[PDB]
Design a protein around this ligand. Structure first.
Ligand SMILES: O=C([O-])C(=O)[O-]
Ligand SMILES: O=C([O-])C(=O)[O-]
Ligand SMILES: O=C([O-])C(=O)[O-]
Ligand SMILES: O=C([O-])C(=O)[O-]
Ligand SMILES: [Mg+2]
Ligand SMILES: [Mg+2]
Ligand SMILES: [Mg+2]
Ligand SMILES: [Mg+2]
Lengths: 259, 263, 263, 261
């Protein structure tokens, strides 16, 4: 583990990259010995910096869930990152393309917590008990590091950039979350489809997993937090002028336009 | 009734207007005493020309259904027009904006006929018996006459093949007896925002009614609605302008969706 | 921001306009530099007067939801107004046409609160948690300022208590988690004919959204949405003029109906 | 256009590539002037040769459906190929891995025809009228050409990458449920590798069947009663390796499984 000052330095470079819309060199190429522990430390530092700047923690995401599951990927488990208030866009919003560098849209479910969730022994059942509503959610992911590597993604707040909630809120017991499915349209054509079971076999699993990862840091998932569980589609690039419409069937839809 | 030659020449000017994407003056201003029968005669001549050029009749539309019903509108009954093969786009198509003048999208249901329908006494029941499937349909409408003289009337619309330009089918095909057609409803999004919503009962109290009306209108001309034709029943939303770069997505709930992009 | 005294006097003129059923000139024409905050201040003063006369606050409405969403409209966000006890009519009422100036009917859903809602960070989820029942609601809207100067702006509407005049509740009360509120749909009949149709998602993509927005708007004024209040979420149809002798019947399908007659 | 005897020579090379499980150079590289018409002519010849050897035509498939839709791909419309009887494996079967070169599994719906479909004006509604049953279907695809935009000519010539078909799950009448929302989870060796929803196939998985009838009409060919028509995959293909077990869960449409040996 690098010393605190190195983590802060890396975080400040990611911050400037995000604000300037100018990518930096992959952190792992400049810091060949970086570990996963370092990457989460850098993330913590960046998030700390951004909250100091006037942002507020609103929740967390779990990512690389598809890659953790795929036999072909060397990724062995999910990543996580922190969701801040300024990342949220309303359903039907115009999204400022110029804010982002290489934005892509992916399709998720979100858990809105009525009660806190704390590890180390958090289960799926705890998640069900603590969840007020499940709601469809799009994630807008981005990269502050050049991709000419998991350590780079994690350092870079797990690729976080935007979240768009919409559709129909449901109580968790209302229907089988595993069979929620979606069609992602971009510019009028279906680009990806998927089913929620594709997220770790049950889209609530990542929420328990996450609570358990945060416990050693004396961190819990707080009541009121929104937790994105992971994408069940591949991400699709968003370019200026693109309209997205994601149809979750009887769970409603989420749309936006890049301007 | 003007002579056949006058009908043919008005038809030719509409045809050139469409081909050139350049509007003509409202027919009703150049011909102040034009009748409804003249307007349909001009339409018949234009469709004749188009078919002579190699186009094929695929069905018909019923239009001005909302206005026929609205008390604030002087329109007393629907109009109709002919749908040709080159008007049809598949769900999820890029539509060439340059092909059109002032295109607008509206939200309809279509009836695909298994059997022919002939007037003069066609009923809603006949329509049910003859219909193979009901399917969501968008209509792309346009205007080859100026709307404000450099306003248009019903005679201009009817002459102008009832504003026909495009049709986009999509969604879930259903047998007519599968659910209550009156309560099919839709949300019309453009560029990610809902611009209009509507329910199918807004078309003449039952979206199948215009099909019987249409078969009855065509009966005097020794024309029927043929097996295999697609009949668009009328829009249950107001039309929404389509501009280059616009994406539309029309969500018919459990009846599926229809989308396209103007390029 | 004009002084309190100016706000009070504009409020008094609206009040007289309502009492006399005689419109005043558009406030926005007499006060060319009026701000949104001025307009809400005038509304606050008018509601204060009305409550001092013996009226009681029963809830609020969110308005201009369609226009806030429509790309062709310069309105960037909804408005709001205060609902008073004397605005409410029961389902199946005779409504005195003479009480109003240019009344119009529109089609909404209402949220009956079990618990209070306070901003600044109210979400859709908070609205669900606080809502006791959702119920169909018609709004009767009116205008105490002239629409064409012998046009009105948003400042006139907002000052004019957001065009509030009447509310008519009816139909089936449901718990918010009972069905998808987005797909509640309605047919608005007047005199036996369907004049408008609509679907509830046409209100801000989800009819509960305006309730959170409203709680957030009121938070700076140290005002919250109280337990027991009725909150009208915005119309999903265009408004339809109401004239003496008109019957309305608004069919919300499996959510019931609301009807009335203007006498 | 190449002369017909060149179509025949290309088809013979593909036939040998398949038999020896050894890829040939991309046809589009060996034959730079190749047209889509040539590609389908090569396919027709190869299918004729296989039938002459004792195979029987059992149906057709429509492919490249995702690529035709996706903006990131220059492919403009789907392709099609012929399904022969020796391509079909039973639900729960061992599949001989050694018979294939670079096999991959994908997830489809199939339409079992009660009545023939003939173009050139075939519609989705004609497909519904002509379909006896819709049934889940896996396709096993493969490539007899090595892959170092005109690649489409190679895929088409190579019988649209056809190799195998595995039918299973629940047979339904076409009006039973909305086919657009049929969904599936593709497991390989116990883990979900892909998921997808059938509307990913041309916005309605029946659409390609009408398009296919219309493509075949100029050749005096129709889709015949009794044929099985695979509509196109709504998942990306997943490599199949010796030892692999696949289990594809279509929810209330049942499942299809197989094992590579
Ligand atoms: O990485 C992610 O954000 C994901 O997989 O959803
Ligand atoms: O005029 C029309 O086409 C209509 O109302 O649908
Ligand atoms: O302005 C209003 O009252 C509305 O939109 O419902
Ligand atoms: O090419 C294929 O076979 C497909 O897309 O299903
Ligand atoms: Mg994600
Ligand atoms: Mg129409
Ligand atoms: Mg209202
Ligand atoms: Mg295939």
């Amino acid at each position: 583990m690098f010393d605190k000052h190195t983590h802060t330095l890396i975080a400040q470079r990611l911050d400037q990259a995000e604000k300037q819309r100018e990518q930096i060199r992959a952190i792992s190429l400049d810091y060949p010995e970086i570990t996963i522990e370092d990457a989460y430390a850098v993330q913590r530092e960046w998030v700390r910096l951004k909250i100091a700047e006037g942002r507020t923690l609103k929740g967390h995401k779990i990512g690389l869930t598809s890659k953790a599951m795929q036999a072909s990927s060397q990724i062995s488990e999910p990543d996580y990152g922190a969701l801040l208030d300024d990342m949220f866009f309303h359903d039907g919003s115009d999204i400022p393309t110029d804010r982002f560098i290489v934005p892509r849209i992916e399709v998720e479910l979100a858990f809105v917590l009525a009660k806190p969730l704390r590890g180390p022994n958090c289960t799926l059942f705890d998640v069900y008990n603590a969840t007020d509503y499940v709601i469809p959610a799009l994630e807008l992911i981005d990269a502050r590091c050049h991709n000419i590597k998991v350590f780079d993604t994690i350092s870079d707040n797990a690729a976080n950039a935007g979240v768009i909630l919409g559709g129909r809120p449901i109580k968790p017991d209302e229907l089988d979350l595993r069979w929620i499915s979606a069609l992602m349209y971009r510019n009028g054509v279906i680009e990806e489809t998927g089913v929620a079971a594709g997220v770790l076999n049950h889209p609530a699993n990542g929420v328990a997993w996450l609570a358990n990862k945060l416990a050693p840091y004396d961190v819990q998932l707080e009541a009121g937090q929104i937790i994105l569980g992971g994408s069940f589609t591949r991400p699709v690039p968003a370019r200026k002028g693109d309209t997205f419409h994601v149809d979750y069937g009887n769970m409603g839809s989420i749309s936006c336009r890049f301007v």
